[PDB]
Design a protein around this ligand. Sequence first.
Ligand SMILES: Cc1oncc1/C(O)=C(\C#N)C(=O)Nc1ncc(S(C)(=O)=O)c(-c2cccc(F)c2)n1
Ligand SMILES: Nc1ncnc2c1ncn2[C@@H]1O[C@H](COP(=O)(O)OP(=O)(O)OP(=O)(O)O)[C@@H](O)[C@H]1O
Ligand SMILES: [Mg+2]
Ligand SMILES: [Mg+2]
Ligand SMILES: [Zn+2]
Length: 359
Amino acid sequence: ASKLRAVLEKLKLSRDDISTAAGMVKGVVDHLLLRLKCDSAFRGVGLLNTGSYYEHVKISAPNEFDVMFKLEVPRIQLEEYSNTRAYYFVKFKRNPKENPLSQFLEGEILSASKMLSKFRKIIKEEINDIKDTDVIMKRKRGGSPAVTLLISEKISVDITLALESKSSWPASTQEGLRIQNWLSAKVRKQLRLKPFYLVPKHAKEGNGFQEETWRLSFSHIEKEILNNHGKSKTCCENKEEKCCRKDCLKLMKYLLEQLKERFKDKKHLDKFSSYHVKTAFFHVCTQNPQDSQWDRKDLGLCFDNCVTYFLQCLRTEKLENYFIPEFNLFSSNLIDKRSKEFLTKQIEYERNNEFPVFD
Ligand SMILES: Cc1oncc1/C(O)=C(\C#N)C(=O)Nc1ncc(S(C)(=O)=O)c(-c2cccc(F)c2)n1
Ligand SMILES: Nc1ncnc2c1ncn2[C@@H]1O[C@H](COP(=O)(O)OP(=O)(O)OP(=O)(O)O)[C@@H](O)[C@H]1O
Ligand SMILES: [Mg+2]
Ligand SMILES: [Mg+2]
Ligand SMILES: [Zn+2]
């Protein structure tokens, strides 16, 4: 109640930190975007600002920014890899015109691993010829489609290549985005007329990866929803309509960040990410579609609703991707049962003890 408000106060981003970080990031990102347009493959590349900073749910410090370098790929033909619902091979239809991505084809399949290698290579060469600014590239991770930069040893920038398709969303999405009773059927229809994205994250094949696979991304839609999040079009535009939706997501993010920090050397929580609590939070929005169910005065209850839904997800080992219902973020394949039981026990103790990990 009063204690949660004091936590939200401490999580607020400093105006001075925002001013310095926003300037540093824009300078680096604008430069790379310019250099990439100069390569034959990446002529159409455009910027999408995404994740928690641009959703206004970043907590503590503005020290991690996300951007998509998107690229329209006309006449795309997707093939689902192995019923995984989220991972696809990219092929092309008949096209008289030369394909600008020819260099990355393996037979008829656009190689995610080749395209990412060149993307990463270009960015690497380019961040040397930045001289005015201190910028290094961190080592490639199999988990992330992103190239990660560190600016002035303090600010991380994740850049993901993203193919843009203006086609209908794949069939795996048909029962996703259950926003009809919250944001309206007409908004669901408008969002589903927007493009979708594919990022070069590869699917599991036995011991390793199917290195040519891409994964669906709806980061653009997640941002649209968080920054236009009410049943009322004037939600949070006036003092009579201040909801606690973003406050509840910030508190869930802080709960996980604090537990991950406390066990950062003991492995049990390494497989959990902020995307787990972001996804769970969108599900609680579907369950609680009225702005009256997110009144600022009910912060403690609204936060409890998010905590108990997340606990139910851990116990049942079910957390659907918000866009792709048959994609289980909490499957055995991804997170072993012992890790989920360990997180459940820490979160139960926090809920039973008024969240001492916040104090
Ligand atoms: C960059 C950027 O800009 N827009 C989206 C975007 C972007 O990151 C993604 C998109 N679209 C995305 O899918 N990222 C991703 N996917 C899986 C994972 S994991 C290893 O499966 O947990 C992670 C991830 C890995 C390590 C640490 C961490 F914190 C997160 N990250
Ligand atoms: N497993 C995932 N599946 C799909 N999209 C993901 C996944 N992980 C991350 N993303 C997308 O990439 C964005 C950036 O991810 P990132 O890990 O930086 O988290 P975030 O939402 O910015 O929150 P924070 O950085 O504060 O933890 C997410 O908001 C989401 O749209
Ligand atoms: Mg982020
Ligand atoms: Mg990131
Ligand atoms: Zn609101």
